[PDB]
mmCIF file with all atom_site columns, all heavy atoms in Angstrom:
data_model
loop_
_atom_site.group_PDB
_atom_site.id
_atom_site.type_symbol
_atom_site.label_atom_id
_atom_site.label_alt_id
_atom_site.label_comp_id
_atom_site.label_asym_id
_atom_site.label_entity_id
_atom_site.label_seq_id
_atom_site.pdbx_PDB_ins_code
_atom_site.Cartn_x
_atom_site.Cartn_y
_atom_site.Cartn_z
_atom_site.occupancy
_atom_site.B_iso_or_equiv
_atom_site.pdbx_formal_charge
_atom_site.auth_seq_id
_atom_site.auth_comp_id
_atom_site.auth_asym_id
_atom_site.auth_atom_id
_atom_site.pdbx_PDB_model_num
ATOM 1   N N   . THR A 1 1  ? -3.030  16.778 54.716 1.00 0.00 ? 1  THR A N   1
ATOM 2   C CA  . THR A 1 1  ? -3.279  16.013 53.497 1.00 0.00 ? 1  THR A CA  1
ATOM 3   C C   . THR A 1 1  ? -3.920  16.810 52.342 1.00 0.00 ? 1  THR A C   1
ATOM 4   O O   . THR A 1 1  ? -4.527  16.210 51.476 1.00 0.00 ? 1  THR A O   1
ATOM 5   C CB  . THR A 1 1  ? -4.150  14.786 53.858 1.00 0.00 ? 1  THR A CB  1
ATOM 6   O OG1 . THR A 1 1  ? -5.310  15.217 54.555 1.00 0.00 ? 1  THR A OG1 1
ATOM 7   C CG2 . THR A 1 1  ? -3.376  13.802 54.697 1.00 0.00 ? 1  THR A CG2 1
ATOM 8   N N   . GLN A 1 2  ? -3.823  18.144 52.326 1.00 0.00 ? 2  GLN A N   1
ATOM 9   C CA  . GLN A 1 2  ? -4.459  18.973 51.315 1.00 0.00 ? 2  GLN A CA  1
ATOM 10  C C   . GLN A 1 2  ? -3.734  18.759 50.002 1.00 0.00 ? 2  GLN A C   1
ATOM 11  O O   . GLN A 1 2  ? -2.581  19.128 49.864 1.00 0.00 ? 2  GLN A O   1
ATOM 12  C CB  . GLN A 1 2  ? -4.479  20.447 51.725 1.00 0.00 ? 2  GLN A CB  1
ATOM 13  C CG  . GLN A 1 2  ? -5.319  20.686 52.986 1.00 0.00 ? 2  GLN A CG  1
ATOM 14  C CD  . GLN A 1 2  ? -4.851  21.882 53.792 1.00 0.00 ? 2  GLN A CD  1
ATOM 15  O OE1 . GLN A 1 2  ? -4.321  22.844 53.240 1.00 0.00 ? 2  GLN A OE1 1
ATOM 16  N NE2 . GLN A 1 2  ? -5.014  21.801 55.096 1.00 0.00 ? 2  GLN A NE2 1
ATOM 17  N N   . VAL A 1 3  ? -4.409  18.114 49.031 1.00 0.00 ? 3  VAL A N   1
ATOM 18  C CA  . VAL A 1 3  ? -3.828  17.801 47.750 1.00 0.00 ? 3  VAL A CA  1
ATOM 19  C C   . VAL A 1 3  ? -4.602  18.464 46.615 1.00 0.00 ? 3  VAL A C   1
ATOM 20  O O   . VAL A 1 3  ? -5.805  18.219 46.414 1.00 0.00 ? 3  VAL A O   1
ATOM 21  C CB  . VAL A 1 3  ? -3.656  16.285 47.503 1.00 0.00 ? 3  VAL A CB  1
ATOM 22  C CG1 . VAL A 1 3  ? -2.445  15.764 48.269 1.00 0.00 ? 3  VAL A CG1 1
ATOM 23  C CG2 . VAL A 1 3  ? -4.876  15.477 47.877 1.00 0.00 ? 3  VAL A CG2 1
ATOM 24  N N   . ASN A 1 4  ? -3.915  19.313 45.823 1.00 0.00 ? 4  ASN A N   1
ATOM 25  C CA  . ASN A 1 4  ? -4.454  19.793 44.581 1.00 0.00 ? 4  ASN A CA  1
ATOM 26  C C   . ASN A 1 4  ? -4.431  18.710 43.496 1.00 0.00 ? 4  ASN A C   1
ATOM 27  O O   . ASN A 1 4  ? -3.715  17.716 43.624 1.00 0.00 ? 4  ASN A O   1
ATOM 28  C CB  . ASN A 1 4  ? -3.648  20.977 44.062 1.00 0.00 ? 4  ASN A CB  1
ATOM 29  C CG  . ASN A 1 4  ? -3.681  22.134 44.995 1.00 0.00 ? 4  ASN A CG  1
ATOM 30  O OD1 . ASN A 1 4  ? -4.689  22.796 45.086 1.00 0.00 ? 4  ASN A OD1 1
ATOM 31  N ND2 . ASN A 1 4  ? -2.596  22.406 45.654 1.00 0.00 ? 4  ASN A ND2 1
ATOM 32  N N   . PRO A 1 5  ? -5.234  18.892 42.432 1.00 0.00 ? 5  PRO A N   1
ATOM 33  C CA  . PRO A 1 5  ? -5.097  17.958 41.321 1.00 0.00 ? 5  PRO A CA  1
ATOM 34  C C   . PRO A 1 5  ? -3.662  17.875 40.845 1.00 0.00 ? 5  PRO A C   1
ATOM 35  O O   . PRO A 1 5  ? -2.999  18.894 40.747 1.00 0.00 ? 5  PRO A O   1
ATOM 36  C CB  . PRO A 1 5  ? -5.986  18.565 40.239 1.00 0.00 ? 5  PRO A CB  1
ATOM 37  C CG  . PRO A 1 5  ? -7.037  19.271 41.010 1.00 0.00 ? 5  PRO A CG  1
ATOM 38  C CD  . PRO A 1 5  ? -6.331  19.848 42.194 1.00 0.00 ? 5  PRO A CD  1
ATOM 39  N N   . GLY A 1 6  ? -3.168  16.642 40.618 1.00 0.00 ? 6  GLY A N   1
ATOM 40  C CA  . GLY A 1 6  ? -1.778  16.409 40.270 1.00 0.00 ? 6  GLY A CA  1
ATOM 41  C C   . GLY A 1 6  ? -0.833  16.197 41.428 1.00 0.00 ? 6  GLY A C   1
ATOM 42  O O   . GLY A 1 6  ? 0.347   15.975 41.200 1.00 0.00 ? 6  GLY A O   1
ATOM 43  N N   . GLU A 1 7  ? -1.343  16.202 42.663 1.00 0.00 ? 7  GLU A N   1
ATOM 44  C CA  . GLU A 1 7  ? -0.554  15.983 43.879 1.00 0.00 ? 7  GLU A CA  1
ATOM 45  C C   . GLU A 1 7  ? -0.949  14.691 44.584 1.00 0.00 ? 7  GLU A C   1
ATOM 46  O O   . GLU A 1 7  ? -2.074  14.174 44.380 1.00 0.00 ? 7  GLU A O   1
ATOM 47  C CB  . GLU A 1 7  ? -0.748  17.128 44.839 1.00 0.00 ? 7  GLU A CB  1
ATOM 48  C CG  . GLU A 1 7  ? -0.316  18.438 44.220 1.00 0.00 ? 7  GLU A CG  1
ATOM 49  C CD  . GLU A 1 7  ? -0.280  19.603 45.156 1.00 0.00 ? 7  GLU A CD  1
ATOM 50  O OE1 . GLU A 1 7  ? -1.115  19.678 46.109 1.00 0.00 ? 7  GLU A OE1 1
ATOM 51  O OE2 . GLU A 1 7  ? 0.538   20.515 44.882 1.00 0.00 ? 7  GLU A OE2 1
ATOM 52  N N   . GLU A 1 8  ? -0.052  14.244 45.435 1.00 0.00 ? 8  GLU A N   1
ATOM 53  C CA  . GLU A 1 8  ? -0.326  13.141 46.380 1.00 0.00 ? 8  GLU A CA  1
ATOM 54  C C   . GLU A 1 8  ? 0.344   13.443 47.697 1.00 0.00 ? 8  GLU A C   1
ATOM 55  O O   . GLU A 1 8  ? 1.158   14.337 47.836 1.00 0.00 ? 8  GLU A O   1
ATOM 56  C CB  . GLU A 1 8  ? 0.188   11.827 45.819 1.00 0.00 ? 8  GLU A CB  1
ATOM 57  C CG  . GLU A 1 8  ? 1.711   11.719 45.624 1.00 0.00 ? 8  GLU A CG  1
ATOM 58  C CD  . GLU A 1 8  ? 2.099   10.308 45.261 1.00 0.00 ? 8  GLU A CD  1
ATOM 59  O OE1 . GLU A 1 8  ? 1.938   9.870  44.084 1.00 0.00 ? 8  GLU A OE1 1
ATOM 60  O OE2 . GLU A 1 8  ? 2.408   9.576  46.210 1.00 0.00 ? 8  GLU A OE2 1
ATOM 61  N N   . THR A 1 9  ? -0.001  12.643 48.678 1.00 0.00 ? 9  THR A N   1
ATOM 62  C CA  . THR A 1 9  ? 0.539   12.785 50.008 1.00 0.00 ? 9  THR A CA  1
ATOM 63  C C   . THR A 1 9  ? 0.462   11.453 50.708 1.00 0.00 ? 9  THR A C   1
ATOM 64  O O   . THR A 1 9  ? -0.341  10.600 50.332 1.00 0.00 ? 9  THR A O   1
ATOM 65  C CB  . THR A 1 9  ? -0.262  13.849 50.783 1.00 0.00 ? 9  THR A CB  1
ATOM 66  O OG1 . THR A 1 9  ? 0.378   14.138 52.022 1.00 0.00 ? 9  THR A OG1 1
ATOM 67  C CG2 . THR A 1 9  ? -1.724  13.424 51.041 1.00 0.00 ? 9  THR A CG2 1
ATOM 68  N N   . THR A 1 10 ? 1.313   11.272 51.724 1.00 0.00 ? 10 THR A N   1
ATOM 69  C CA  . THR A 1 10 ? 1.246   10.121 52.593 1.00 0.00 ? 10 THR A CA  1
ATOM 70  C C   . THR A 1 10 ? 1.176   10.507 54.053 1.00 0.00 ? 10 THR A C   1
ATOM 71  O O   . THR A 1 10 ? 2.076   11.214 54.540 1.00 0.00 ? 10 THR A O   1
ATOM 72  C CB  . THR A 1 10 ? 2.391   9.133  52.342 1.00 0.00 ? 10 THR A CB  1
ATOM 73  O OG1 . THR A 1 10 ? 2.419   8.748  50.958 1.00 0.00 ? 10 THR A OG1 1
ATOM 74  C CG2 . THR A 1 10 ? 2.227   7.861  53.209 1.00 0.00 ? 10 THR A CG2 1
ATOM 75  N N   . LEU A 1 11 ? 0.134   10.038 54.725 1.00 0.00 ? 11 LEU A N   1
ATOM 76  C CA  . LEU A 1 11 ? -0.151  10.310 56.130 1.00 0.00 ? 11 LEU A CA  1
ATOM 77  C C   . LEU A 1 11 ? 0.002   9.017  56.898 1.00 0.00 ? 11 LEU A C   1
ATOM 78  O O   . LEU A 1 11 ? -0.432  7.958  56.458 1.00 0.00 ? 11 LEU A O   1
ATOM 79  C CB  . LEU A 1 11 ? -1.596  10.793 56.275 1.00 0.00 ? 11 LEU A CB  1
ATOM 80  C CG  . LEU A 1 11 ? -2.095  11.048 57.695 1.00 0.00 ? 11 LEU A CG  1
ATOM 81  C CD1 . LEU A 1 11 ? -1.526  12.267 58.341 1.00 0.00 ? 11 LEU A CD1 1
ATOM 82  C CD2 . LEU A 1 11 ? -3.605  11.189 57.721 1.00 0.00 ? 11 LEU A CD2 1
ATOM 83  N N   . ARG A 1 12 ? 0.562   9.128  58.107 1.00 0.00 ? 12 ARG A N   1
ATOM 84  C CA  . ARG A 1 12 ? 0.590   8.010  59.038 1.00 0.00 ? 12 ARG A CA  1
ATOM 85  C C   . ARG A 1 12 ? -0.057  8.432  60.349 1.00 0.00 ? 12 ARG A C   1
ATOM 86  O O   . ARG A 1 12 ? 0.210   9.526  60.876 1.00 0.00 ? 12 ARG A O   1
ATOM 87  C CB  . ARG A 1 12 ? 1.987   7.480  59.288 1.00 0.00 ? 12 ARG A CB  1
ATOM 88  C CG  . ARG A 1 12 ? 1.995   6.337  60.260 1.00 0.00 ? 12 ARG A CG  1
ATOM 89  C CD  . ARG A 1 12 ? 3.316   5.572  60.342 1.00 0.00 ? 12 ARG A CD  1
ATOM 90  N NE  . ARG A 1 12 ? 4.372   6.424  60.759 1.00 0.00 ? 12 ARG A NE  1
ATOM 91  C CZ  . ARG A 1 12 ? 5.521   6.663  60.078 1.00 0.00 ? 12 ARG A CZ  1
ATOM 92  N NH1 . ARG A 1 12 ? 5.764   6.189  58.832 1.00 0.00 ? 12 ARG A NH1 1
ATOM 93  N NH2 . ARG A 1 12 ? 6.401   7.465  60.650 1.00 0.00 ? 12 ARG A NH2 1
ATOM 94  N N   . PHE A 1 13 ? -0.909  7.569  60.890 1.00 0.00 ? 13 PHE A N   1
ATOM 95  C CA  . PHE A 1 13 ? -1.415  7.807  62.240 1.00 0.00 ? 13 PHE A CA  1
ATOM 96  C C   . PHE A 1 13 ? -1.501  6.480  63.022 1.00 0.00 ? 13 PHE A C   1
ATOM 97  O O   . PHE A 1 13 ? -1.654  5.449  62.428 1.00 0.00 ? 13 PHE A O   1
ATOM 98  C CB  . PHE A 1 13 ? -2.738  8.591  62.227 1.00 0.00 ? 13 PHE A CB  1
ATOM 99  C CG  . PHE A 1 13 ? -3.942  7.797  61.790 1.00 0.00 ? 13 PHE A CG  1
ATOM 100 C CD1 . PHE A 1 13 ? -4.697  7.059  62.688 1.00 0.00 ? 13 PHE A CD1 1
ATOM 101 C CD2 . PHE A 1 13 ? -4.345  7.820  60.455 1.00 0.00 ? 13 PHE A CD2 1
ATOM 102 C CE1 . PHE A 1 13 ? -5.773  6.322  62.282 1.00 0.00 ? 13 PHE A CE1 1
ATOM 103 C CE2 . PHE A 1 13 ? -5.453  7.099  60.047 1.00 0.00 ? 13 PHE A CE2 1
ATOM 104 C CZ  . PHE A 1 13 ? -6.187  6.363  60.964 1.00 0.00 ? 13 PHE A CZ  1
ATOM 105 N N   . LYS A 1 14 ? -1.429  6.579  64.343 1.00 0.00 ? 14 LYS A N   1
ATOM 106 C CA  . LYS A 1 14 ? -1.592  5.422  65.232 1.00 0.00 ? 14 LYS A CA  1
ATOM 107 C C   . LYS A 1 14 ? -3.087  5.263  65.596 1.00 0.00 ? 14 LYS A C   1
ATOM 108 O O   . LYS A 1 14 ? -3.732  6.202  66.084 1.00 0.00 ? 14 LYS A O   1
ATOM 109 C CB  . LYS A 1 14 ? -0.759  5.589  66.490 1.00 0.00 ? 14 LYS A CB  1
ATOM 110 C CG  . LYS A 1 14 ? -0.535  4.306  67.250 1.00 0.00 ? 14 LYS A CG  1
ATOM 111 C CD  . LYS A 1 14 ? 0.342   4.555  68.489 1.00 0.00 ? 14 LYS A CD  1
ATOM 112 C CE  . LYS A 1 14 ? 0.781   3.260  69.133 1.00 0.00 ? 14 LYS A CE  1
ATOM 113 N NZ  . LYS A 1 14 ? 1.902   3.558  70.103 1.00 0.00 ? 14 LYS A NZ  1
ATOM 114 N N   . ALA A 1 15 ? -3.601  4.066  65.384 1.00 0.00 ? 15 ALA A N   1
ATOM 115 C CA  . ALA A 1 15 ? -5.009  3.796  65.618 1.00 0.00 ? 15 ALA A CA  1
ATOM 116 C C   . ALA A 1 15 ? -5.181  3.404  67.063 1.00 0.00 ? 15 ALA A C   1
ATOM 117 O O   . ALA A 1 15 ? -5.269  2.231  67.426 1.00 0.00 ? 15 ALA A O   1
ATOM 118 C CB  . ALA A 1 15 ? -5.466  2.689  64.667 1.00 0.00 ? 15 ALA A CB  1
ATOM 119 N N   . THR A 1 16 ? -5.199  4.430  67.931 1.00 0.00 ? 16 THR A N   1
ATOM 120 C CA  . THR A 1 16 ? -5.154  4.161  69.362 1.00 0.00 ? 16 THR A CA  1
ATOM 121 C C   . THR A 1 16 ? -6.441  3.714  70.031 1.00 0.00 ? 16 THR A C   1
ATOM 122 O O   . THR A 1 16 ? -6.398  3.279  71.176 1.00 0.00 ? 16 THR A O   1
ATOM 123 C CB  . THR A 1 16 ? -4.646  5.359  70.125 1.00 0.00 ? 16 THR A CB  1
ATOM 124 O OG1 . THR A 1 16 ? -5.567  6.440  69.947 1.00 0.00 ? 16 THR A OG1 1
ATOM 125 C CG2 . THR A 1 16 ? -3.252  5.769  69.663 1.00 0.00 ? 16 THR A CG2 1
ATOM 126 N N   . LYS A 1 17 ? -7.588  3.824  69.328 1.00 0.00 ? 17 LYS A N   1
ATOM 127 C CA  . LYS A 1 17 ? -8.876  3.491  69.966 1.00 0.00 ? 17 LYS A CA  1
ATOM 128 C C   . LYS A 1 17 ? -9.649  2.507  69.101 1.00 0.00 ? 17 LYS A C   1
ATOM 129 O O   . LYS A 1 17 ? -9.816  2.735  67.913 1.00 0.00 ? 17 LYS A O   1
ATOM 130 C CB  . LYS A 1 17 ? -9.723  4.756  70.131 1.00 0.00 ? 17 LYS A CB  1
ATOM 131 C CG  . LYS A 1 17 ? -9.081  5.794  71.055 1.00 0.00 ? 17 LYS A CG  1
ATOM 132 C CD  . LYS A 1 17 ? -9.933  7.020  71.190 1.00 0.00 ? 17 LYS A CD  1
ATOM 133 C CE  . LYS A 1 17 ? -9.362  8.036  72.173 1.00 0.00 ? 17 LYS A CE  1
ATOM 134 N NZ  . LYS A 1 17 ? -9.408  7.563  73.587 1.00 0.00 ? 17 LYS A NZ  1
ATOM 135 N N   . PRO A 1 18 ? -10.163 1.425  69.700 1.00 0.00 ? 18 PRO A N   1
ATOM 136 C CA  . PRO A 1 18 ? -10.855 0.437  68.894 1.00 0.00 ? 18 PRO A CA  1
ATOM 137 C C   . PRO A 1 18 ? -12.296 0.843  68.624 1.00 0.00 ? 18 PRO A C   1
ATOM 138 O O   . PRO A 1 18 ? -12.994 1.410  69.477 1.00 0.00 ? 18 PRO A O   1
ATOM 139 C CB  . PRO A 1 18 ? -10.786 -0.825 69.738 1.00 0.00 ? 18 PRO A CB  1
ATOM 140 C CG  . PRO A 1 18 ? -10.748 -0.323 71.143 1.00 0.00 ? 18 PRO A CG  1
ATOM 141 C CD  . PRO A 1 18 ? -10.050 1.016  71.117 1.00 0.00 ? 18 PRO A CD  1
ATOM 142 N N   . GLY A 1 19 ? -12.784 0.525  67.445 1.00 0.00 ? 19 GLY A N   1
ATOM 143 C CA  . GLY A 1 19 ? -14.120 0.933  67.009 1.00 0.00 ? 19 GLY A CA  1
ATOM 144 C C   . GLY A 1 19 ? -14.208 1.028  65.519 1.00 0.00 ? 19 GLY A C   1
ATOM 145 O O   . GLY A 1 19 ? -13.208 0.868  64.822 1.00 0.00 ? 19 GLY A O   1
ATOM 146 N N   . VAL A 1 20 ? -15.417 1.289  65.028 1.00 0.00 ? 20 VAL A N   1
ATOM 147 C CA  . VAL A 1 20 ? -15.599 1.738  63.659 1.00 0.00 ? 20 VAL A CA  1
ATOM 148 C C   . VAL A 1 20 ? -15.715 3.267  63.665 1.00 0.00 ? 20 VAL A C   1
ATOM 149 O O   . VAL A 1 20 ? -16.313 3.815  64.612 1.00 0.00 ? 20 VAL A O   1
ATOM 150 C CB  . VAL A 1 20 ? -16.830 1.053  62.961 1.00 0.00 ? 20 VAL A CB  1
ATOM 151 C CG1 . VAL A 1 20 ? -16.537 -0.397 62.668 1.00 0.00 ? 20 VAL A CG1 1
ATOM 152 C CG2 . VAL A 1 20 ? -18.083 1.156  63.784 1.00 0.00 ? 20 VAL A CG2 1
ATOM 153 N N   . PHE A 1 21 ? -15.094 3.919  62.693 1.00 0.00 ? 21 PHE A N   1
ATOM 154 C CA  . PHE A 1 21 ? -15.005 5.367  62.686 1.00 0.00 ? 21 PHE A CA  1
ATOM 155 C C   . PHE A 1 21 ? -15.241 5.878  61.279 1.00 0.00 ? 21 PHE A C   1
ATOM 156 O O   . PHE A 1 21 ? -14.863 5.211  60.312 1.00 0.00 ? 21 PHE A O   1
ATOM 157 C CB  . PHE A 1 21 ? -13.599 5.878  63.027 1.00 0.00 ? 21 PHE A CB  1
ATOM 158 C CG  . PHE A 1 21 ? -13.144 5.521  64.426 1.00 0.00 ? 21 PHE A CG  1
ATOM 159 C CD1 . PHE A 1 21 ? -12.596 4.272  64.698 1.00 0.00 ? 21 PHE A CD1 1
ATOM 160 C CD2 . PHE A 1 21 ? -13.226 6.451  65.467 1.00 0.00 ? 21 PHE A CD2 1
ATOM 161 C CE1 . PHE A 1 21 ? -12.191 3.958  66.000 1.00 0.00 ? 21 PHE A CE1 1
ATOM 162 C CE2 . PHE A 1 21 ? -12.771 6.173  66.736 1.00 0.00 ? 21 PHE A CE2 1
ATOM 163 C CZ  . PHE A 1 21 ? -12.266 4.889  67.029 1.00 0.00 ? 21 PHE A CZ  1
ATOM 164 N N   . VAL A 1 22 ? -15.856 7.026  61.158 1.00 0.00 ? 22 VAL A N   1
ATOM 165 C CA  . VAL A 1 22 ? -15.944 7.729  59.856 1.00 0.00 ? 22 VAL A CA  1
ATOM 166 C C   . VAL A 1 22 ? -14.585 8.264  59.443 1.00 0.00 ? 22 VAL A C   1
ATOM 167 O O   . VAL A 1 22 ? -13.769 8.713  60.278 1.00 0.00 ? 22 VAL A O   1
ATOM 168 C CB  . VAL A 1 22 ? -16.990 8.853  59.977 1.00 0.00 ? 22 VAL A CB  1
ATOM 169 C CG1 . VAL A 1 22 ? -16.940 9.817  58.802 1.00 0.00 ? 22 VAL A CG1 1
ATOM 170 C CG2 . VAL A 1 22 ? -18.373 8.280  60.093 1.00 0.00 ? 22 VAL A CG2 1
ATOM 171 N N   . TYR A 1 23 ? -14.314 8.250  58.152 1.00 0.00 ? 23 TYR A N   1
ATOM 172 C CA  . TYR A 1 23 ? -13.347 9.174  57.565 1.00 0.00 ? 23 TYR A CA  1
ATOM 173 C C   . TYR A 1 23 ? -14.069 9.957  56.482 1.00 0.00 ? 23 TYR A C   1
ATOM 174 O O   . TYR A 1 23 ? -14.997 9.498  55.845 1.00 0.00 ? 23 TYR A O   1
ATOM 175 C CB  . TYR A 1 23 ? -12.094 8.465  56.994 1.00 0.00 ? 23 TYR A CB  1
ATOM 176 C CG  . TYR A 1 23 ? -12.301 7.582  55.805 1.00 0.00 ? 23 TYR A CG  1
ATOM 177 C CD1 . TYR A 1 23 ? -12.433 8.102  54.525 1.00 0.00 ? 23 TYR A CD1 1
ATOM 178 C CD2 . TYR A 1 23 ? -12.276 6.201  55.934 1.00 0.00 ? 23 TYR A CD2 1
ATOM 179 C CE1 . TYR A 1 23 ? -12.578 7.256  53.442 1.00 0.00 ? 23 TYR A CE1 1
ATOM 180 C CE2 . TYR A 1 23 ? -12.384 5.345  54.833 1.00 0.00 ? 23 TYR A CE2 1
ATOM 181 C CZ  . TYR A 1 23 ? -12.572 5.902  53.589 1.00 0.00 ? 23 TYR A CZ  1
ATOM 182 O OH  . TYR A 1 23 ? -12.781 5.123  52.455 1.00 0.00 ? 23 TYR A OH  1
ATOM 183 N N   . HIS A 1 24 ? -13.609 11.209 56.254 1.00 0.00 ? 24 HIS A N   1
ATOM 184 C CA  . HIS A 1 24 ? -14.188 12.025 55.182 1.00 0.00 ? 24 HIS A CA  1
ATOM 185 C C   . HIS A 1 24 ? -13.241 13.096 54.743 1.00 0.00 ? 24 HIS A C   1
ATOM 186 O O   . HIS A 1 24 ? -12.362 13.492 55.495 1.00 0.00 ? 24 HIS A O   1
ATOM 187 C CB  . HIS A 1 24 ? -15.540 12.653 55.627 1.00 0.00 ? 24 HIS A CB  1
ATOM 188 C CG  . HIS A 1 24 ? -15.461 13.558 56.805 1.00 0.00 ? 24 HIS A CG  1
ATOM 189 N ND1 . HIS A 1 24 ? -15.216 14.910 56.684 1.00 0.00 ? 24 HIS A ND1 1
ATOM 190 C CD2 . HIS A 1 24 ? -15.691 13.351 58.130 1.00 0.00 ? 24 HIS A CD2 1
ATOM 191 C CE1 . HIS A 1 24 ? -15.235 15.463 57.906 1.00 0.00 ? 24 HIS A CE1 1
ATOM 192 N NE2 . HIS A 1 24 ? -15.504 14.535 58.789 1.00 0.00 ? 24 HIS A NE2 1
ATOM 193 N N   . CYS A 1 25 ? -13.481 13.624 53.551 1.00 0.00 ? 25 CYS A N   1
ATOM 194 C CA  . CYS A 1 25 ? -12.778 14.821 53.074 1.00 0.00 ? 25 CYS A CA  1
ATOM 195 C C   . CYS A 1 25 ? -13.336 16.036 53.820 1.00 0.00 ? 25 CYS A C   1
ATOM 196 O O   . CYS A 1 25 ? -14.496 16.043 54.180 1.00 0.00 ? 25 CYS A O   1
ATOM 197 C CB  . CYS A 1 25 ? -13.014 14.924 51.593 1.00 0.00 ? 25 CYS A CB  1
ATOM 198 S SG  . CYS A 1 25 ? -12.244 16.316 50.776 1.00 0.00 ? 25 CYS A SG  1
ATOM 199 N N   . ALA A 1 26 ? -12.499 17.049 54.016 1.00 0.00 ? 26 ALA A N   1
ATOM 200 C CA  . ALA A 1 26 ? -12.858 18.222 54.795 1.00 0.00 ? 26 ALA A CA  1
ATOM 201 C C   . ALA A 1 26 ? -11.992 19.420 54.407 1.00 0.00 ? 26 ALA A C   1
ATOM 202 O O   . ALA A 1 26 ? -11.183 19.862 55.204 1.00 0.00 ? 26 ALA A O   1
ATOM 203 C CB  . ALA A 1 26 ? -12.736 17.921 56.303 1.00 0.00 ? 26 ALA A CB  1
ATOM 204 N N   . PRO A 1 27 ? -12.149 19.912 53.156 1.00 0.00 ? 27 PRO A N   1
ATOM 205 C CA  . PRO A 1 27 ? -11.285 21.063 52.803 1.00 0.00 ? 27 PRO A CA  1
ATOM 206 C C   . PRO A 1 27 ? -11.841 22.322 53.425 1.00 0.00 ? 27 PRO A C   1
ATOM 207 O O   . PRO A 1 27 ? -13.038 22.590 53.349 1.00 0.00 ? 27 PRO A O   1
ATOM 208 C CB  . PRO A 1 27 ? -11.397 21.097 51.262 1.00 0.00 ? 27 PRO A CB  1
ATOM 209 C CG  . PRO A 1 27 ? -12.153 19.880 50.836 1.00 0.00 ? 27 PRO A CG  1
ATOM 210 C CD  . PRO A 1 27 ? -12.966 19.472 52.012 1.00 0.00 ? 27 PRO A CD  1
ATOM 211 N N   . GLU A 1 28 ? -10.959 23.101 54.067 1.00 0.00 ? 28 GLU A N   1
ATOM 212 C CA  . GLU A 1 28 ? -11.405 24.297 54.784 1.00 0.00 ? 28 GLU A CA  1
ATOM 213 C C   . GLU A 1 28 ? -12.299 25.194 53.919 1.00 0.00 ? 28 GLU A C   1
ATOM 214 O O   . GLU A 1 28 ? -12.008 25.467 52.756 1.00 0.00 ? 28 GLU A O   1
ATOM 215 C CB  . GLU A 1 28 ? -10.187 25.132 55.235 1.00 0.00 ? 28 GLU A CB  1
ATOM 216 C CG  . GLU A 1 28 ? -10.598 26.427 55.952 1.00 0.00 ? 28 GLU A CG  1
ATOM 217 C CD  . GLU A 1 28 ? -9.440  27.132 56.665 1.00 0.00 ? 28 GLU A CD  1
ATOM 218 O OE1 . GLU A 1 28 ? -8.282  26.703 56.538 1.00 0.00 ? 28 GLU A OE1 1
ATOM 219 O OE2 . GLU A 1 28 ? -9.718  28.144 57.367 1.00 0.00 ? 28 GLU A OE2 1
ATOM 220 N N   . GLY A 1 29 ? -13.440 25.553 54.468 1.00 0.00 ? 29 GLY A N   1
ATOM 221 C CA  . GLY A 1 29 ? -14.384 26.378 53.750 1.00 0.00 ? 29 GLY A CA  1
ATOM 222 C C   . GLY A 1 29 ? -15.400 25.674 52.891 1.00 0.00 ? 29 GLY A C   1
ATOM 223 O O   . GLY A 1 29 ? -16.372 26.330 52.455 1.00 0.00 ? 29 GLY A O   1
ATOM 224 N N   . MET A 1 30 ? -15.145 24.377 52.619 1.00 0.00 ? 30 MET A N   1
ATOM 225 C CA  . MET A 1 30 ? -15.904 23.562 51.670 1.00 0.00 ? 30 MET A CA  1
ATOM 226 C C   . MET A 1 30 ? -16.382 22.230 52.243 1.00 0.00 ? 30 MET A C   1
ATOM 227 O O   . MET A 1 30 ? -16.760 21.366 51.468 1.00 0.00 ? 30 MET A O   1
ATOM 228 C CB  . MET A 1 30 ? -15.002 23.127 50.509 1.00 0.00 ? 30 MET A CB  1
ATOM 229 C CG  . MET A 1 30 ? -14.328 24.217 49.760 1.00 0.00 ? 30 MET A CG  1
ATOM 230 S SD  . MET A 1 30 ? -13.937 23.422 48.211 1.00 0.00 ? 30 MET A SD  1
ATOM 231 C CE  . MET A 1 30 ? -12.173 23.194 48.404 1.00 0.00 ? 30 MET A CE  1
ATOM 232 N N   . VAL A 1 31 ? -16.340 22.084 53.553 1.00 0.00 ? 31 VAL A N   1
ATOM 233 C CA  . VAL A 1 31 ? -16.450 20.744 54.151 1.00 0.00 ? 31 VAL A CA  1
ATOM 234 C C   . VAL A 1 31 ? -17.774 20.002 53.837 1.00 0.00 ? 31 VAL A C   1
ATOM 235 O O   . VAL A 1 31 ? -17.740 18.924 53.291 1.00 0.00 ? 31 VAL A O   1
ATOM 236 C CB  . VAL A 1 31 ? -16.150 20.741 55.684 1.00 0.00 ? 31 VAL A CB  1
ATOM 237 C CG1 . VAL A 1 31 ? -16.335 19.356 56.266 1.00 0.00 ? 31 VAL A CG1 1
ATOM 238 C CG2 . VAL A 1 31 ? -14.762 21.309 56.016 1.00 0.00 ? 31 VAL A CG2 1
#
């Protein structure tokens, strides 16, 4: 999902485990 300014992306994943979970940005080197 690495998007520069002016880009977009679409990701799909299966939510296989029930719970509340963090999501966050994590660009390599800059997390």
Side-chain angles (χ1 to χ4, degrees):
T1 53
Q2 296 152 29
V3 282
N4 298 287
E7 300 188 329
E8 65 172 78
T9 189
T10 305
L11 176 72
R12 180 168 62 238
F13 74 87
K14 197 179 190 166
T16 63
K17 298 180 176 290
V20 288
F21 298 82
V22 168
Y23 66 79
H24 61 89
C25 180
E28 177 168 6
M30 305 201 254
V31 177

